């Protein structure tokens, strides 16, 4: 059946209580990053109906589905999605400054913390991508875009590149394009189909619509 | 396409 590529942004995690990360000084930056990592470990923070509907969608489509997120949180994973591409990295990971190896990390990061991949342990760096830095997984993403039959952007502002250009890439390759957002994005007019409203309402409704049209469950 | 993470 059709190949589906989903791009998500901060809007989909808003109803779960996750705010935009940093809308500089290393110590303050580390404090904020550490507070956001900590937030993700609170029992009260959970995936919402929009996250859960995307897991249902991957269950129905198997390898014909790919989820790409700008988000640093792990709510897609917790909802049940697998092989989620974090194009801006993750808060619950760090990277060895020397080897570049990525490690799971749940607690605070401090300058005292070191890698366990190198002969002599090296400092740890954020795994998230900041403005000016190069996004992750781009070869895989553009390959997926070139093969997608439907491209769905959810909770994205249209302000942040390269992610905001994906809808244009989808169009060039002949994908149907769908925007699901609280309000119109900066590139809302570039989408062929669009629904607006809270993600926890809009996303499950669309996913049902799509699954039924695909004759692939509910 | 591609390029660094950047605001509009
Ligand atoms: Zn190392």
Distance CA B2, CA B8 (A): 14
Please tell me which residue in A51, A76, A86, A88 is annotated as part of the active site: A88
Quick one: which of A54, A88, A67 has its CA closest to A160? A88
Residues B3, A162: C-beta atoms closer than 8 Å: yes
What count of other Cβ atoms lies within 10 Å of the Cβ of residue A184?
14
Judged on CB neighbours under 10 Å (0-12, 13-18, 19+), A75 is buried
A32, A114, A126, A86: CA torsion to nearest 10: -120
Token pair belonging to A74 = 């792990």
Contact list, B5 vs chain A (CB under 8 Å): 88, 129-135, 160-162
- With b for 16 or more beta-carbon neighbours within 10 A and e for fewer, the A188-200 pattern comes to eebbeebeeeebb
Quick one: which of B5, B8, B3 has its CA closest to A133? B5
- Segments making up each domain of chain A, as ranges: 1-17+47-88+135-218, 18-46+89-134
Closest CA–CA distance from residue A42 to any residue of chain B (Å) = 29
**Expt. technique:** X-ray
- Closest-approach residue (CA) in chain B for A130: B5
Q: Residue A162: is the preceding peptide bond cis (ω within 30°)?
A: yes
The arrangement of secondary structure in A1-17+47-88+135-218, i.e. its CATH architecture, is 3-Layer(aba) Sandwich (3.40)
Contact list, A134 vs chain B (CB under 8 Å): 4-5
How big is the A-B interface in CB pairs under 8 Å? 39
- With b for 16 or more beta-carbon neighbours within 10 A and e for fewer, the A82-92 pattern comes to eebbbbbbbbb
- Closest-approach residue (CA) in chain B for A170: B1
Distance CA A113, CA A124 (A): 7
User: 3-state DSSP helix/strand/coil percent for chain A, to nearest 5?
Assistant: 35, 20, 45
Asked whether the beta carbons of A109 and A30 are under 8 A apart, the reply is yes
A159 assigned to active site: no
Beta-strand pair A102-104/A93-96 = antiparallel
The residues with which A118 forms a beta bridge, in sequence order, are: none
Asked whether the beta carbons of A151 and A191 are under 8 A apart, the reply is no
Task: Identify the H or E element spanning A138.
Answer: helix A138-147
What is residue A147's DSSP assignment?
A: H
Nearest to B8 among A88, A138, A159 (CB): A159
Distance CA A179, CA A170 (A): 12
Q: How far is CA A200 from the centre of its chain?
A: 16
Token look-up 């700008």 returns: A70
Asked whether the beta carbons of A148 and A139 are under 8 A apart, the reply is no
In chain A, positions 78-117, which contact chain B (CB-CB < 8 Å)? 88
Distance CA A109, CA A126 (A): 9
């Amino acid at each position: 059946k059709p190949r589906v590529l989903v791009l998500t942004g901060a809007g989909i995690s808003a109803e779960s209580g996750i705010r935009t990360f940093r809308a500089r000084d290393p110590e303050l930056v580390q404090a904020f990053a550490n507070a956001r990592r900590r937030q993700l470990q609170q029992p009260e923070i959970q995936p919402n109906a929009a996250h859960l509907a995307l897991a249902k969608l991957q269950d129905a489509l198997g390898d014909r589905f790919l989820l790409v997120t700008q988000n640093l949180d792990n709510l897609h994973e917790r909802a049940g999605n697998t092989n989620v591409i974090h194009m801006h990295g993750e808060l619950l990971k760090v990277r060895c400054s020397q080897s570049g190896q990525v490690l799971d990390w749940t607690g605070d990061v401090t300058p005292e913390d070191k890698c366990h991949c190198c002969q002599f342990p090296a400092p740890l760096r954020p795994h998230y991508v900041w403005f000016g830095e190069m996004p992750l997984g781009m070869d895989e993403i553009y390959m997926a875009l070139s093969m997608a039959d439907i491209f769905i952007a959810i909770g994205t502002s249209g302000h942040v590149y390269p992610a905001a250009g994906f809808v244009h890439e989808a169009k060039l390759h002949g994908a149907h394009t769908v925007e699901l957002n609280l309000e119109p994005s900066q590139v809302g007019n570039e989408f062929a189909e669009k629904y607006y409203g809270p993600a926890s309402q809009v996303v499950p409704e669309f996913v049902e619509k799509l699954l039924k049209g695909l004759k692939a469950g509910s | 396409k591609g390029g660094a993470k950047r605001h509009r």
